Amino acid sequence: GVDISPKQDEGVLKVIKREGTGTEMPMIGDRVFVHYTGWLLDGTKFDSSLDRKDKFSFDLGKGEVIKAWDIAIATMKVGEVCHITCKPEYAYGSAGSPPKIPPNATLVFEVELFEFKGEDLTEEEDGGIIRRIQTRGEGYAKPNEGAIVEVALEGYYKDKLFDQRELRFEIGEGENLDLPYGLERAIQRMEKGEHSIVYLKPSYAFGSVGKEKFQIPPNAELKYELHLKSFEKA
Ligand SMILES: CCC(C)(C)C(=O)C(=O)N1CCCC[C@H]1C(=O)O[C@H](CCc1ccc(OC)c(OC)c1)c1cccc(OCC(=O)O)c1
CATH class of the missing domain: 3.10.50.40 (Chitinase A; domain 3)
Structure with a gap:
């Protein structure tokens, strides 16, 4: 994967599975619509939006989601599917998110970007x-x-x-x-x-x-x- 963390500390590593279209990417403040799956590093699946009726949506760059996502989604094109490996510093840190996420957990997400808008x-x-x-x-x-x-x-x-x-x-x-x-x-x-x-x-x-x-x-x-x-x- 490519290190996309601002500090270049390998905090967020991105692998593109399918390239998207056009040139535009979501900007800070834009509403964004994705499907995702999340696993722990050992491959334990903890959640997927595919298991529910609606796409997951959030407003980019506002600390509405873990830092790895504010970083990663900004780099995506519509139609893109990527995998992101997220060190705990860019996710849930020492607290974790029990019971799903243990303390100091590195996380992997598959993310597909469907749409974004102002x-x-x-x-x-x-x-x-x-x-x-x-x-x-x-x-x-x-x-x-x-x-x-x-x-x-x-x-x-x-x-x-x-x-x-x-x-x-x-x-x-x-x-x-x-x-x-x-x-x-x-x-x-x-x-x-x-x-x-x-x-x-x-x-x-x-x-x-x-x-x-x-x-x-x-x-x-x-x-x-x-x-x-x-x-x-x-
Ligand atoms: C761990 C299980 C969950 C929460 C369902 C998960 O899959 C997950 O890890 N996520 C959901 C999809 C976006 C990335 C990630 C996430 O950010 O969820 C966040 C977790 C809360 C959070 C927000 C901001 C933070 O820092 C600025 C923060 O720091 C620890 C925590 C989240 C955002 C919006 C809705 C939400 O839960 C509702 C739902 O399940 O749809 C969870």
Whole structure:
């Protein structure tokens, strides 16, 4: 296997069993759909999603799964099947996960990637605001209502640029700066230094009114490229 651990300490070793398609791989924040089987190093099977009705899904790069999985799934293409050998430091460590996983266990997973998609940032989960993180930010802190943010933004309608600015403004006051509501909600989910693409459905953008000065008609879907440069909370 190929050592895919950031520290190159052979913590996560990947063997590709079947190559996937295209070039794209899941990004941090993306929802990911896989089937897997897990064995201890001695070949004892402890679990498989194949034994259940649904694919296993999780959000990548958020510490929702063991570190070996956040590392490994990021390297996969759609359709890929790989085997990953995971040292305990990248899995369950000294604690283990009784009764299935003993302390200090090296784990082997077979993983097949079926699908991934951008993160739906909406409260209703109606697909109205979809994010694709390009580059992860620094701290985990995010701007809240009333935070003063510095943001570089590019707005596109049908891939044509209509707005490109570097702004400093208070979250909650974006409307007066011709920023759509959904963009301000998206910024509240971003970390300092993060570069993301955010897709807005009309309901979260300029709705039935549009934005005439930006040549945006009623009921327009928009795409923004956003860089959160800095912010001061509160
Ligand atoms: C050991 C048996 C289980 C948990 C079923 C297993 O097969 C397993 O080992 N996994 C399930 C498939 C993804 C990889 C792996 C896993 O991460 O499961 C994690 C275990 C919990 C965990 C999360 C994050 C951690 O660090 C940031 C962490 O550190 C010890 C523990 C998990 C994630 C989501 C759901 C879940 O259980 C529900 C289910 O069985 O579907 C288990």
